[PDB]
Amino acid sequence: EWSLILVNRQNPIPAQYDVELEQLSNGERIDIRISPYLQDLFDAARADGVYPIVASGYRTTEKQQEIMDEKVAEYKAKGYTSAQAKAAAETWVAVPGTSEHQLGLAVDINADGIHSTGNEVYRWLDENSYRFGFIRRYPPDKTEITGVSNEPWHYRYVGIEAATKIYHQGLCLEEYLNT
Ligand SMILES: [Zn+2]
């Protein structure tokens, strides 16, 4: 049940949540408990000609604050007021303390580019990640529940058992944890 912890705008991360982190090959940090499942996920893809990379894993509070601030600045640079920019940014970037990147269980996956395209890696993960305990966290048809826009790059570890049941039923994490 530890891998089924929900962190949303409706469910802030507890400040008691300390994560045992290990450093990936690219310097990014993840929870040590998802490490072999993540390694298996990438070995699987590379066997099918898909070459994925971890663009973002664990993030400190200030790190999320930096990402939010730059996103806000983008909207302000395009005629949005402070309030409008922040409101528009919160739909893409999570408020510092509501991001599951602070859990260390979430990874932003991109293509390496030189072997696979962005489309190829995202579609392979869409139909294979569940077998290794990872789910496409923010579906385009579940944006009203997750409160987050379409992010085909964001994947969250929930465990093989949960991910399989989530994928087969076509639900998101919020719906799955709903009785
Ligand atoms: Zn993400």
Side-chain angles (χ1 to χ4, degrees):
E1 222 84 52
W2 67 268
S3 58
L4 297 182
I5 176 176
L6 182 68
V7 175
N8 294 333
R9 180 53 175 172
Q10 295 76 8
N11 297 272
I13 181 182
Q16 337 324 306
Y17 197 92
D18 185 3
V19 202
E20 280 74 37
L21 300 166
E22 65 177 75
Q23 183 179 174
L24 292 180
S25 184
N26 63 346
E28 211 69 21
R29 301 169 64 91
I30 62 170
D31 196 321
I32 66 178
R33 291 171 289 185
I34 79 175
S35 177
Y37 299 95
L38 180 62
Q39 178 63 36
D40 290 340
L41 177 65
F42 285 1
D43 287 334
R46 286 189 290 265
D48 287 29
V50 175
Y51 290 75
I53 66 174
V54 176
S56 178
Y58 176 81
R59 300 178 196 166
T60 61
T61 301
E62 169 69 18
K63 179 56 184 181
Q64 266 288 150
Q65 193 63 72
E66 288 185 352
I67 296 181
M68 173 69 69
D69 286 334
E70 285 187 4
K71 190 65 179 181
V72 169
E74 285 188 351
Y75 287 102
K76 294 182 65 62
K78 77 185 187 243
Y80 293 87
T81 62
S82 298
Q84 292 177 343
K86 292 188 122 52
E90 286 179 3
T91 63
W92 290 100
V93 182
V95 176
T98 61
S99 176
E100 60 179 20
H101 279 278
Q102 306 181 230
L103 293 179
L105 304 176
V107 285
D108 293 333
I109 308 180
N110 293 343
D112 66 328
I114 202 175
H115 275 89
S116 307
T117 71
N119 302 125
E120 292 170 318
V121 54
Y122 292 165
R123 289 195 132 248
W124 186 93
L125 289 169
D126 179 83
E127 293 177 350
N128 295 272
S129 62
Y130 66 98
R131 305 203 310 270
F132 301 92
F134 297 90
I135 55 174
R136 188 155 61 101
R137 185 57 180 85
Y138 308 112
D141 62 327
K142 303 298 176 59
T143 59
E144 63 282 358
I145 306 179
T146 60
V148 185
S149 302
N150 194 350
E151 296 185 349
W153 53 79
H154 188 104
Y155 280 81
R156 157 74 186 277
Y157 180 86
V158 292
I160 302 177
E161 180 184 7
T164 301
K165 296 180 180 179
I166 284 177
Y167 179 77
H168 284 344
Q169 295 169 14
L171 298 175
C172 56
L173 183 60
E174 286 78 356
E175 292 172 308
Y176 177 78
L177 300 177
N178 193 336
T179 68

